[PDB]
Design a protein around this ligand. Sequence first.
Ligand SMILES: Cc1cc2nc3c(=O)[nH]c(=O)nc-3n(C[C@H](O)[C@H](O)[C@H](O)COP(=O)(O)OP(=O)(O)OC[C@H]3O[C@@H](n4cnc5c(N)ncnc54)[C@H](O)[C@@H]3O)c2cc1C
Ligand SMILES: Cc1cc2nc3c(=O)[nH]c(=O)nc-3n(C[C@H](O)[C@H](O)[C@H](O)COP(=O)(O)OP(=O)(O)OC[C@H]3O[C@@H](n4cnc5c(N)ncnc54)[C@H](O)[C@@H]3O)c2cc1C
Ligand SMILES: Cc1cc2nc3c(=O)[nH]c(=O)nc-3n(C[C@H](O)[C@H](O)[C@H](O)COP(=O)(O)OP(=O)(O)OC[C@H]3O[C@@H](n4cnc5c(N)ncnc54)[C@H](O)[C@@H]3O)c2cc1C
Ligand SMILES: CC1=C(CCOP(=O)(O)OP(=O)(O)O)S/C(=C(\C)O)N1Cc1cnc(C)nc1N
Ligand SMILES: CC1=C(CCOP(=O)(O)OP(=O)(O)O)S/C(=C(\C)O)N1Cc1cnc(C)nc1N
Ligand SMILES: CC1=C(CCOP(=O)(O)OP(=O)(O)O)S/C(=C(\C)O)N1Cc1cnc(C)nc1N
Ligand SMILES: [Mg+2]
Ligand SMILES: [Mg+2]
Ligand SMILES: [Mg+2]
Lengths: 582, 582, 582
Amino acid sequence: TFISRFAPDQPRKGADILVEALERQGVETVFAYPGGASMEIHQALTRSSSIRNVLPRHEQGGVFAAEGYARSSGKPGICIATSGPGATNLVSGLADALLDSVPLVAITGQVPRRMIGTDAFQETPIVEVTRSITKHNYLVMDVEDIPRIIEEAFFLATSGRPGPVLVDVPKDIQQQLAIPNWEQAMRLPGYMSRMPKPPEDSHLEQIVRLISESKKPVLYVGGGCLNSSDELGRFVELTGIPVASTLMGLGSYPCDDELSLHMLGMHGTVYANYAVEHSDLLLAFGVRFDDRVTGKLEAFASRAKIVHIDIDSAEIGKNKTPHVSVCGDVKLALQGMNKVLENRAEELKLDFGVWRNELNVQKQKFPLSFKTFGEAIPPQYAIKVLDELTDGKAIISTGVGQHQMWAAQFYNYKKPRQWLSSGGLGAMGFGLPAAIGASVANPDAIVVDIDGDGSFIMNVQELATIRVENLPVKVLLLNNQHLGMVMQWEDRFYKANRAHTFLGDPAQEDEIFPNMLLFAAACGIPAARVTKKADLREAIQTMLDTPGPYLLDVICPHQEHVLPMIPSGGTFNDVITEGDGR
Amino acid sequence: TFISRFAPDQPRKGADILVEALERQGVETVFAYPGGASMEIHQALTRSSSIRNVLPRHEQGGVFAAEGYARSSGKPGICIATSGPGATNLVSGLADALLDSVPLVAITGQVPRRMIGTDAFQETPIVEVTRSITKHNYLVMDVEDIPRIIEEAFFLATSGRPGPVLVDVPKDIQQQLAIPNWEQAMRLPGYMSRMPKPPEDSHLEQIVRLISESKKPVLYVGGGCLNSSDELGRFVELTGIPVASTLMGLGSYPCDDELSLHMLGMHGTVYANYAVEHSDLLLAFGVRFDDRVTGKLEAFASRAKIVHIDIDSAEIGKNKTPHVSVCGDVKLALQGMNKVLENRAEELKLDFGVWRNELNVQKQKFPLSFKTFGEAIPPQYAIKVLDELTDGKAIISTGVGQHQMWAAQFYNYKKPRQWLSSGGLGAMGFGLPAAIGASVANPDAIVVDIDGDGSFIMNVQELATIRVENLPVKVLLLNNQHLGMVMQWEDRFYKANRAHTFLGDPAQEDEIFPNMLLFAAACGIPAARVTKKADLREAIQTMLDTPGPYLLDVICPHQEHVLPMIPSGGTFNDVITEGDGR
Amino acid sequence: TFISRFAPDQPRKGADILVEALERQGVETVFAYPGGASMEIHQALTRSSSIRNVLPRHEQGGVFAAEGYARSSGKPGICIATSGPGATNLVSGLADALLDSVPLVAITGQVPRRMIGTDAFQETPIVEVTRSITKHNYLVMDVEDIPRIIEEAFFLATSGRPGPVLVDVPKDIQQQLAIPNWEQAMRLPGYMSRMPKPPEDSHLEQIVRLISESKKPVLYVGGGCLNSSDELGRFVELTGIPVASTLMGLGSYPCDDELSLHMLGMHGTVYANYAVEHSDLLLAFGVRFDDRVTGKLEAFASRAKIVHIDIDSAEIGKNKTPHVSVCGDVKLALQGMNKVLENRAEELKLDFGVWRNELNVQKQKFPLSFKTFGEAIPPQYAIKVLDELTDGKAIISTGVGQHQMWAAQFYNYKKPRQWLSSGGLGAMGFGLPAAIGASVANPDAIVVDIDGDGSFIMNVQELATIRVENLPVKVLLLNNQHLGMVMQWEDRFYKANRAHTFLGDPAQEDEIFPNMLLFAAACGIPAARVTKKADLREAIQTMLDTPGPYLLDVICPHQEHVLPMIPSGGTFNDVITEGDGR
Ligand SMILES: Cc1cc2nc3c(=O)[nH]c(=O)nc-3n(C[C@H](O)[C@H](O)[C@H](O)COP(=O)(O)OP(=O)(O)OC[C@H]3O[C@@H](n4cnc5c(N)ncnc54)[C@H](O)[C@@H]3O)c2cc1C
Ligand SMILES: Cc1cc2nc3c(=O)[nH]c(=O)nc-3n(C[C@H](O)[C@H](O)[C@H](O)COP(=O)(O)OP(=O)(O)OC[C@H]3O[C@@H](n4cnc5c(N)ncnc54)[C@H](O)[C@@H]3O)c2cc1C
Ligand SMILES: Cc1cc2nc3c(=O)[nH]c(=O)nc-3n(C[C@H](O)[C@H](O)[C@H](O)COP(=O)(O)OP(=O)(O)OC[C@H]3O[C@@H](n4cnc5c(N)ncnc54)[C@H](O)[C@@H]3O)c2cc1C
Ligand SMILES: CC1=C(CCOP(=O)(O)OP(=O)(O)O)S/C(=C(\C)O)N1Cc1cnc(C)nc1N
Ligand SMILES: CC1=C(CCOP(=O)(O)OP(=O)(O)O)S/C(=C(\C)O)N1Cc1cnc(C)nc1N
Ligand SMILES: CC1=C(CCOP(=O)(O)OP(=O)(O)O)S/C(=C(\C)O)N1Cc1cnc(C)nc1N
Ligand SMILES: [Mg+2]
Ligand SMILES: [Mg+2]
Ligand SMILES: [Mg+2]
């Protein structure tokens, strides 16, 4: 039973209705940046005693913070911006939330209804702009539609395949006095009719049947299993099938486990890719067969009977044609199959020890490796130390590039919603703001931003946000003085021809530029720099032990390469296993 | 006669064709940020010995730099980004360039043609996204269309009413070998047929006729007169008509002149607004009657016979219905009218001395003013000192807010393309990157970024760009520790109720946060802070005299208000002339 | 005070709400064709005792009948169709109503809301299809929105510049029981803010001023003056300015008048075109400067000071740049100028007798002419007889082609809304159904369809409608056994090379095919055929005197050409005055 700050018969501003509509959705935290078209909303936010506002220093930082908030909780992330320049600063975050299927609700202010289409001051058709990069969007044309639209927005953003939903609110609507109706039905008849219903026992036992008929099966786990950690692990026990996870699905099945093949794909482990290459049954649960995982589709799982389970019917038979398909929640599909496997453990032989040992050979023959040059810090080693000193219980957010891959390879995530990274869009400057949102959603948790110097500087302004909001955000900055991932492709495919990849100062080459420590000092954040591998262990320990925000500038040799690697649109027999830029 | 780096019969990469297509457009400088979808382009850029690339630390900084490059030269600004996150980081700059009619060409990398529509890695329908915020955009579907599209892009961006044009280039097109045809005709039959032709002598002498029949005329000059400085001044001599300029039209007519009414509008001078209010003839040249200038249209120039000249036919009769209209280049319209006025000076009485003295009374009665509290630095005074110490010859770029208005009020711009500011979209974080582009376009010029602490921090990362590129960018930072313009509306309309407008640290209120000096130090840029008005003159002098980049952190009392002010959608009799937040 | 068939607190079907919504708009007649998706609506129509339904035999006939109903009354025309094939059969009528600015409301049935987008049975995104060919359209997503949308539909269709408005209604919405709210406000804030307000006395007396300063003025009257017959005639008396009318503006000023220059344009009279060519003041009232009137714009009224009055701001300065422009209702503009001319008749000389006599010379030198070959009936002569025997008081609807032009040239329409013809779209098969709708709107009026054999046969099925509905529709069929207008262009520009223009039977060339008399007999309509000019007078008399429907098959020599003629994109000095296909 909800308690309002207004009488049921009392006229309220549209902005007040909007905020209460958020309160009724259980919203505790928003990321809002003020402007003329959304001042009424911010005024109403102050009148709320339940909704906290974290003020970013950039709306892109605001929406990315809403993502990190969402990714590390399961709750929808809410960001608010003003019209024009404020709204257009959300675009990258919206597209990012769409490709990674992150539940997010964005509210943008807008010019009065009378001025829409006249190219007015700070006017942008943000609905027209964001239609192709959001799950759905709205343009409120009446104050009475506010309670309904907000309900529809949160419903669409969280249910089915999660995604970003934008609600554009005119300024005059915010000012208009009205009495809200909270019991009006949602106008989504088509969407709800197409919502997948619980899986039939028909489909489920056919899959279980295929499991016993195949003796070389591989689990293909992705971001669709982020809410099925228990059911998935229970499924693995009953089957004994090795697990290959994606960039988006890390943590679903414990990376330190003996049945774990870790990440598969372009920069996935060799033994994971080998498993899929020589599998006869592929259990694709909560994935979307991205080109970064498959390469050339015709060779990907060529001899494998493919089973695909997804809550989105559009993803089924999209890139790779499956044998058996189940459209629905994989959480329920697991529960259904789990009850069958235990009640039918006798009839089913179920022993893939021979196949497991075949993979375990590859797991020892071609394992993840890195070189240690003198006293120079291996970035792979630094992340491994962070794992040990945090016991793999730290929430990790990253930017995009070489550091992103190493953070996914050399950290054993034990539970989902611990790994926050841009995979679909792969947007830089995601790391720091995402850490901000995750720290707010999880106050008592260890939050570490494993960032690259290129990505870190893009939204470096959010360091001020961290200090002001007093968030214990740790920044493990892997500094290679380059746009590493771009540099790596240059060494591999372009004769190491440097095309604007060096981030330092061409007047003083061996001086670290910029001085990231002074960035932290500018925002009153304690920081330190480590260059030698010996001091690395103590340095990271200091970062963790020191209360509040901390920046550790870890200097790494730039010639390092992310291995292994499969060139875009290739096969498993094209895997690069050795080499760098030395 | 152009000299290529390739033989006329030699097959070249599409990326090489693209770069040469830019070379044939006279492009000397681009602002490109590398990524997987645009690596071929960056490789081809290095092979060019005429095109220089300035590497930003953020694509938003890249496109804003392209704007400042364009705004301070008249040449089109070129920015290049990769697919996905790179392209979406250009959005704000594109929308900004559209609303301020700035000639700009944006080139974005894209996934191969075979992968368009599959929600691939780093894929965003940027054409679909930017259609409503660009003049025009393209999606290259063949390597043979590159020379034509690029020619059409630069033509559309610079001709008629200037604007942003985006060209999306697939990765496979960049790699495809081909022989370019540079003599293919442009496919713009409709656009060129609708292009305004030189004004008839019929329309022009009717305007001249109205000039003599009215004895209280006012010139309404805007951003359409940026290329008519000579013709406009010549026109004023022949007529003696007082000149009211817009935010976008500053510098067209010298602000220090005795016939100058300076800026009109919401934050325009009282005597400028009074002139338009009590005019009988309004000469609207190169304007678009924005709501920030007119307020309520019915009261704006209510008793004035309105003459409107614009190169865009869609702007004629859009918001305010004109009496006489001339669709075409105002530069030619002035030249046509100028030759008439001098050859017909005898018949025409032409003496508005009585009307001029009527306005000159208002010019002394209600002039621009500011208070000086103790030793606290008035932001209005600081800008006035900068004017004196630069002799009004310094290129000024600003952010958005209170500092933006004061920089437009208390600096006398003598020539156009000296005032760089976001007016239509009004996007923060514009100041610093725009100064970067302007410094590249004008190396020997004094470039000063009059920025606010809120706007400055948004794209603060571009400080690294300034140092690396060794640009003599001066940063006059007016620090009020607040989002001032938002704070001002709070003091005026919301009982001074602070709704997330304070930018400092709520743990140490009277400490300046963040320490902007350390931001500059992080990027090896010399910086200083001044608090007392006495030290202000020497401090600004030091900033100017010190070679290379410099940051001056000017501390200002936050209670200051931009005056005068007309509330949104008001009349001239609603002007606020006194008051602040004390 | 409206009287409902339902209690204010009684739940009603959505279809019943829809019909009552029409009743509250004063709708007396609809043109509906039944289908599965609109059965509920047709059931509700029978429950109404005020709304009459005319059942067409084709939905294209239905919408064209709604046009004729609208064009000959000023009231909006209402047509109803089912989903899929029914809706797509309205398309031509919708596009036709848009280009001729005809007030029309189309209601289409639709699949249930749950099935929209699944390519269901008889599903077509008719909103998506008709968006570019309607003024506005709706998709009802809730039964509660029915009273509002219908009100907005009729308001948009009739106010401002009239046009077609489509309302798509899902089947489940029609079945859903609800209690309608008739006092809900319309959601058109932007549209109403942009609605032109009454013309200022400022603009009006400037026009009156130009009238006295020019001694060779010409009135350019179009379809915008259809509701200003009295005001226009009063204006002519006060000025004495000759009147040139368009295809859409016939009847506004009496064609038989001595000040009438009749039609101008491609097939307009020579003296009308001469007037505009050598005018110094062009009073363009209620026109849109179509290419069929101007040809090459640069030569059209080259030496004339152009005054343009239109209720659509988008039409001002569209093709031809005007000197003086007044955005608003021309009816009010005339009233405003009329009161000035009479109160200021003394000061104004106002005597264009010299210019009038100059035109009157051309009016006698190059008049409308036709040849009479033996006893063969001249189509021009037949129409002239119809004029005499109906005293120019008969409502005339036509098809498209040679007969359409002759019906506009050789019939003197005394009042507006007497001339019904497709001008903008120029759609064949318009004649017969439009006559149907006009006969229903005007029962006691003489309605004659001057049709061509090609156009007549396209919607010949509506002959059944005429008989069933017992409408006194007269059909003056001008039979040339060819697609004449297409044939004429062949004789003029393609060496008389027949490219599928003959409509008869290539097995019996001099036999009239098809036998149109048997078409009439099939629908129980009395008909006759006349071939010799002598019998023509009595034959037409019989058609008029015979009660009820009648078809007169008038046989004409096909070699006749519409004269004069200006080739597409030409000038006045390119007028073809003599010649045919003999
Ligand atoms: C530099 C870089 C390199 C990369 N290289 C790799 C790589 O080597 N390997 C790799 O794996 N990724 C890599 N990626 C990331 C890659 O681009 C994609 O992000 C990733 O492959 C997609 O992971 P996913 O399909 O498993 O999860 P998602 O993209 O999140 O897809 C989730 C799918 O599961 C479905 N789903 C969601 N919820 C449910 C539910 N409750 N029940 C059932 N189904 C559900 C959804 O409909 C959707 O189809 C890289 C990214 C970057 C930036
Ligand atoms: C915080 C803030 C406050 C503001 N307050 C004010 C204010 O008080 N006063 C004010 O004036 N502005 C103010 N603005 C800016 C305002 O929003 C608009 O940017 C500005 O009013 C538009 O100026 P403009 O129409 O003259 O020039 P533009 O917006 O650049 O329009 C140019 C017009 O001239 C035409 N044109 C272009 N080239 C030619 C040519 N060669 N020949 C003929 N025609 C041409 C174009 O078609 C166009 O119609 C403010 C902005 C901000 C951010
Ligand atoms: C075979 C053929 C040949 C043709 N040849 C000719 C020809 O020779 N000569 C000719 O004239 N036409 C000819 N046409 C027709 C031509 O294509 C156009 O239909 C016609 O020229 C347009 O007439 P109009 O602009 O005057 O009226 P409309 O097309 O109906 O335009 C009405 C205009 O007046 C405005 N308006 C409407 N209501 C009001 C109001 N209350 N107050 C103020 N303004 C208002 C509207 O906004 C609009 O701009 C021909 C058509 C066909 C099929
Ligand atoms: C420059 C760059 C990358 C280099 C990032 O530099 P970093 O310094 O942050 O990372 P790293 O050296 O450890 O690899 S990665 C990349 C990919 C994978 O497309 N892009 C393109 C890119 C460009 N701009 C944004 C916002 N996001 C992006 N991913
Ligand atoms: C926060 C803010 C403003 C305050 C800017 O803070 P500043 O510190 O930079 O400027 P100031 O104190 O001197 O006034 S101005 C404004 C307007 C006029 O809409 N917005 C909204 C806004 C929000 N985000 C962006 C990118 N651009 C914007 N203009
Ligand atoms: C065939 C034809 C025409 C010939 C019509 O044949 P008619 O027999 O009806 O008319 P006519 O001989 O007296 O000239 S006119 C025309 C124009 C002006 O575009 N079209 C093209 C046309 C084709 N189809 C439709 C529905 N409408 C059209 N106007
Ligand atoms: Mg790096
Ligand atoms: Mg500030
Ligand atoms: Mg015919």
